[PDB]
């Protein structure tokens, strides 16, 4: 009887009176309605801890954008004619001029001009070296901004190298344009257009560029600079994010701000000893410092610590192959996630001739230079946002905790009219009949 | 005086054992009812906060399609004038507009021009006793701008030959421009069919680079380069090629390959989109917006602006618009429905060695002429199909409910006829 | 043998039913207006789900390793002029556009006069007994050689060769594809971003092996370079539309994400073959080109699979080229897209080959004029920006579970109803006949 009794209970059950009867469907009808009930509710539940997430992308019209960081590397790293005798000592093998032996490799098939500077300057039988710093090298050889740039616009306004910082990478000295260092208020973009963005003029000085001669294993054939064009936040990684510039052409970098914001696990992989604020780029490099700093005891130029600077004995036989065994051979000293908020800048290259045959006089004159010198060494770069807005792409969570339960709670209404409470109130009734 | 007890109250529809008539260890359910009931205060508010919101999320599709429409080409050589085609008129009131004159009308330093450019305007610039005649920006433009005429010397759209006649004059910031597929005079747009370089546009150019305006001596101008700007876009929308025009370069036979981008944005509250010209566009406005400021602090219009304004005199465009602009820019809100074109570019070498020969003879062409001033360029779909951006409505009223309603099953077993039907038992206590 | 007034056991909210009429019928009114509201959400919801709308679902993943697409890369030109027979010149010869149709040179009078030369060397047919003819034989004989065209291949920093590429017929001729997988061997991944690390190729073009161009042609043939396709493994090269061309005198730099698209099926979506194993929507499209060709023409060209007989230079001029003029105007062929699929994003930059102070070696190395190295060598390198994937998923917007948890909750909401409590009334209505 008691089982008779408890219909007052809130599921729904004709199951229970005194006879025996015709309407024993609803013990199936009711049976039915929970089994689709655990069925569906299960699906939610499974879907839920499944932490999907779903994307939101919208595109926003702005009063401003903020101007990105622009590094810029010529493709050479030591000037020829600034080789030092003692720079070809420590040095020389590294930049390919010396054999093992400190010598000429192939004297019969040098340029008989390269040669001539290489004998004056390379005669080591009989040298007292000096001290000698990789950082002062590069600082001293590398191209210098002054030279290579002839002119600078940024919103039509003028420009000079005294807005660019030195930034060593592996490239070696280079320039980084708006860096924001010296917390200097960031420069922002105010109309679209290649006019109002950044444009330099550059000379790549290609009668400085390291020779190459005889039977050589190098295949540095090519001249132009690497451009990464990268927000302020983060480190330039031109080895590997650099676009190519070429000479004798005005190249059109037309950029769009891109925000993204990801999720923290269980739904996405969001979330440094060397770098205050953490970038993929800045964890990579911290990664690459600390693998070279333990297994080679220098740094080098391009690596931030206090670490000593890796020596061109150390770089040879030390820390290069190094590199080479930190890729291919050994699993990531440190893999690195994407931060939470970032942004990116999204660009299109387009070009034209540099120079027209209008202005190939005047650009020979003012530079004092061949007509073929400016056709093989001057550029032109316009790095600008195409219109003033930010592309959003946003993680957005897929299945919040409040949406699993108005969903469970519906299926349970629509299957057996249970609540909470209906449960709680029948094993109240178990708990009663014990 | 006549009305149920809360102890009768168990008719109710809330789940209460709350009111057996003697206290009881089964206070819990006092407790566990208080408890669902401060569950579903909570969780319902998050529902109709986040409802509030007015969320939206993304829908991308890409359809195959067995013909896409091709878009309006508007191309510009990135010369405005060519020298040759300057008059003495001319030379007189826009003299000092094209750098070619100092402030009153001479060479400014004749020793370092070019002999054969100084020959040239010399001839033309006799000014100490000329009376002058009348000048118009827009007649000017059109005579002295590069002629397609001239500058195009083949024209393929799907393997077919094209003219001239396929183009459509269009005054921009850089001069006398033209537009192919532009859809003016109501004629139905060319489709194209198969994708591949072969079935697009395909125009080969001589930009005429011995036409460009000489620069010479201490000049504070730039305009070092030579080649078109080229916008590739949708016939609703007019070009603002000083903005989204790409370059193309002489020497090259440069590809763009091409996809359709069909954007549908959602208006307030969810997201932002919502007289000069009958469609609206950004583009539209921005140039609208500018028109009308001008025509304002200018009583002028440029030539690229429309209106029924008086077109901007060289006395005007120095002295009035042009720091007008520069004072201008030291809210245009997106479309609804849109559609972008996005671009790959890449490039091969014109001339080959074995035509380099023909193309000096069919033209009549030094073999230097050639190699700086011909191009060919081709605007083609990288395959049929359009690429769909969609902003969806997040979360709709009817699931809003589904939510508050399968909320109220879980915690009470509440209805609106449960919260009615406790408000009648009260509204009957008063 | 129950009351209307007596089912207050009913599931559903009604205090509408005493036995004397009284001013509460607006509880009559409340249910009508709940169960007014229940129909039109839940119809909503209902018309909403077979709808079968989707969302997008758009991640990058970190990843210790990619694998390297494949790369298909094309000369401009398909013959080369010195390496075309006597026999050649005879049956392809109209179809090269060397002779007119009398098998005669065109306009020998405006000719390259070192060009007429050789033509008329090997063009003279007074005596000429004719012999066996296969355009794939021919195309594998005249058609560039990568041997020849590869100066260097790195890969990942190693050394490759002319071996590590597999002959792959096209609309261009013989072309070649890196990283096929066609030796059953396992797919090359790349293991770190940037230009050093990527397929690196320097190509001399040949350009003056190109076909010449002479005299009253009707022609757009003055380009040099290469084209290429980077491209899935699973699909085959469609060079022809989806390559993107290099110049030479420029190292060309092809920065690449892999993207993971996933599509759904219909309803929700048009996701999902007779000469391919694989589907791919270049491979059916190929397979329909093939089968309308055998078809209509009775041959197949060398691109094509098949079993059927290679088209003769007749054939290809007067029946397979129109053929194909005949499939554009417009499409004969539905091809829907695969459900997963790989697709590759490019980025192209460019710098000078060669520099002042290599030129000299480049000319001496490879026995050639400062001319030539400038107007006939580039470099090409394919790689991944960075070590990641784009997943690019359409995912099902509103699946049945989700439905019934709305339904569920919009009838709890407006009546307090169940099925049971339909079931229940369904019961009793019967029970009243």
């Known amino acids: 009887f008691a089982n008779t ?6 599921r729904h ?6 006879l025996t009867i015709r309407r024993v469907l609803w013990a199936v009808a009711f049976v039915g309605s929970l089994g689709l009930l655990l069925v569906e509710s299960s699906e939610r539940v499974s879907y839920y801890f499944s932490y999907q997430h779903v994307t939101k992308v919208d595109e926003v019209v702005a009063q401003s954008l903020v101007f990105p960081a622009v590094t810029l590397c010529n493709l050479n790293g030591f000037r020829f004619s600034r080789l030092t005798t003692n720079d070809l000592y420590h040095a020389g093998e590294l930049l390919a001029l010396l054999d093992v032996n400190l010598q000429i490799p192939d004297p019969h098939l040098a340029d008989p001009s390269v040669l001539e500077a290489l004998r004056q300057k390379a005669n080591f ?13 590069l600082h001293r050889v590398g191209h210098d901004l002054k030279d290579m740039m002839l002119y600078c616009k940024f919103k039509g306004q003028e420009c000079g190298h005294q807005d660019f910082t030195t930034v060593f990478t592996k490239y070696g ?3 980084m344009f708006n860096s924001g260092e010296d917390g200097k208020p960031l420069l922002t973009t105010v109309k679209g257009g290649t006019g109002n963005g950044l444009e330099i003029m550059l000379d790549i000085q290609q009668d400085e560029y390291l020779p190459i001669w005889g039977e050589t294993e190098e295949t540095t054939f090519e001249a132009g600079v690497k451009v990464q ?4 936040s983060e480190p330039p990684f031109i080895q590997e994010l650099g676009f190519g510039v070429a000479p004798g052409f005005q190249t059109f970098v037309a950029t769009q701000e891109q925000r993204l914001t990801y999720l923290p696990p269980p739904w996405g992989e969001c979330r440094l000893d060397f770098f205050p604020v953490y970038s993929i780029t800045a964890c990579r490099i911290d990664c690459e410092t600390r693998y070279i700093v333990e297994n080679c005891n220098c740094r080098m130029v391009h690596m931030p610590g206090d670490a000593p600077f890796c020596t061109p004995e150390q770089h040879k036989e030390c820390a290069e192959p190094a590199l080479g065994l930190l890729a291919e051979k050994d699993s990531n000293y440190c893999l690195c996630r994407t931060p939470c908020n970032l942004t990116r800048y999204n660009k299109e290259l387009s070009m034209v001739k540099i120079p027209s045959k209008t202005s190939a006089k005047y650009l020979e004159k003012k530079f004092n230079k061949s007509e073929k010198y400016i056709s093989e060494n001057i550029l032109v770069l316009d790095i600008f946002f195409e219109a003033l807005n930010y592309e959003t792409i946003e993680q957005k969570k897929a299945y919040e905790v409040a949406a699993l339960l108005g969903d469970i709670g519906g299926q349970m209404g629509l299957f057996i009219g249970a609540s909470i409470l209906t449960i709680l109130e029948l094993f109240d009734y178990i708990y009663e009949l014990i």
């Open 229 to 232: 064009i990268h927000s302020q």
């Open 13 to 18: 059950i004709f199951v229970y009176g005194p």
């Open 5 to 10: 009794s408890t219909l007052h209970g809130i």
């Open 125 to 137: 039988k009989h040298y007292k070296p000096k001290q000698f710093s990789m950082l002062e090298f």
């Open 173 to 175: 000295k280079c320039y």
